[PDB]
């Protein structure tokens, strides 16, 4: 929310890049690390994927 408000204040490339880096580093990387850190003897392994 903070990053989106800061972008909507002034629309340039750097604000957009920060908004995108939020998504890249706070959601998707962590889903990947969660997936690789689990073994197949639990059902969660098949849920996430």
């Amino acid at each position: 929310s903070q990053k989106l408000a800061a972008f909507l204040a002034e629309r340039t490339v750097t604000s957009l890049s920060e908004v995108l880096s939020i998504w890249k580093t706070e959601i998707l990387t962590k889903i990947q690390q969660w997936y690789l850190g689990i073994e197949a003897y639990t059902p969660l392994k098949s849920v996430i994927k």
Binding site: L4, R11, L16, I27, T42
Partner: protein, 50 residues
């Protein structure tokens, strides 16, 4: 969205964020139901942890 009405610029970003957050929340919510089975299903845990 750097070439259109500030609303169109708003809608696109919210539209992507909503899907990402839905999946994130689903995983977080379902996780707590497997902790005890992850323990009681084996007899070959590392001793320094058990």
């Amino acid at each position: 969205p750097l070439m259109g009405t500030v609303k169109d610029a708003r809608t696109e970003l919210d539209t992507v964020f909503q899907v990402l957050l839905q999946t994130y929340r689903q995983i977080i919510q379902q996780a707590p139901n497997y902790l005890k089975a992850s323990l009681s299903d084996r007899q070959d845990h590392q001793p320094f942890l058990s």
